[PDB]
């Protein structure tokens, strides 16, 4: 596509407007249309794509958890049917994002900053599928994408915010999805410690970006230990 007749620059401009208006479904559709133009995305454009779909799937995850909790308590067909409706819509959003990464964002991403960003996303959207799955193959798909993205360790410094956000999300995968709380804690601790030892190399602006994600690693470790 419905965005096939709109200029790429117009879709990006409208994604930024939709973000200002908190219209995240519109923002996601504008960024899908921008991706389908077939050109690689800039750093800013990758971030618009991620923020749009994170917000959309975030609403669906929050709704699914409410309906799942009611359904569990209730144990008529209505609660199950409506939880299934929301689950199917969530799966469709995850499949759309995985479709964009596979056709053809990942294969055309050669720089570490782009390839790690897209592989982290692929891990995240398999993780969201795993949260509602009843499932082993989905978990291994998440793991595989996260692992390729981590193997960041070769190309990025330990304070790189993309590398930090990847390790954050991979640690939560381990804790919540893979039932590996010790792996989760080890990854979060090592990631935090290696970042802390590299902070001395950063400007005031990079330091702010790195320490914000380090605080998320610390918040998890506080809950986990």
């Amino acid at each position: 596509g419905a965005m096939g007749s709109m200029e790429r620059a117009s879709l990006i401009q409208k994604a930024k407007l939709a973000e200002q208006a908190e219209r995240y479904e519109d923002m996601a559709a504008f960024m899908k249309g921008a991706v389908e133009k077939g050109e690689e995305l800039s750093c800013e454009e990758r971030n618009l794509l991620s923020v749009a779909y994170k917000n959309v799937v975030g609403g669906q995850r929050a709704a699914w958890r409410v309906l799942s909790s009611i359904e569990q308590k209730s144990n008529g067909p209505e609660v199950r049917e409506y939880r299934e409706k929301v689950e199917t819509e969530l799966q469709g959003v995850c499949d759309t994002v995985l479709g964009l990464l596979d056709s053809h964002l990942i294969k055309e991403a050669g720089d570490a900053e782009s390839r790690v960003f897209y592989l982290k996303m692929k891990g995240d959207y398999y993780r969201y599928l795993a949260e509602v799955a009843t499932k082993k193959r989905i978990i291994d798909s998440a793991r595989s994408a996260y692992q390729e993205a981590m193997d960041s360790k070769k190309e990025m410094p330990p304070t790189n915010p993309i590398r930090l956000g990847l390790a954050l999300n991979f640690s939560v995968f381990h804790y919540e999805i893979a039932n590996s709380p010790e792996e989760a804690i080890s990854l979060a601790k090592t990631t935090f410690d290696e970042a802390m030892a590299d902070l001395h190399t950063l400007s005031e602006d990079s330091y702010k970006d790195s320490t914000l994600i380090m605080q998320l690693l610390r918040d998890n470790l506080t809950l986990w230990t």
């Binding site: 975030g58 999300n169 994600i213 998320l216 690693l217 918040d219």
Partner: peptide, 7 residues
Amino acid sequence: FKTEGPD
């Protein structure tokens, strides 16, 4: 738990 980016 905390994951990267918005809610």
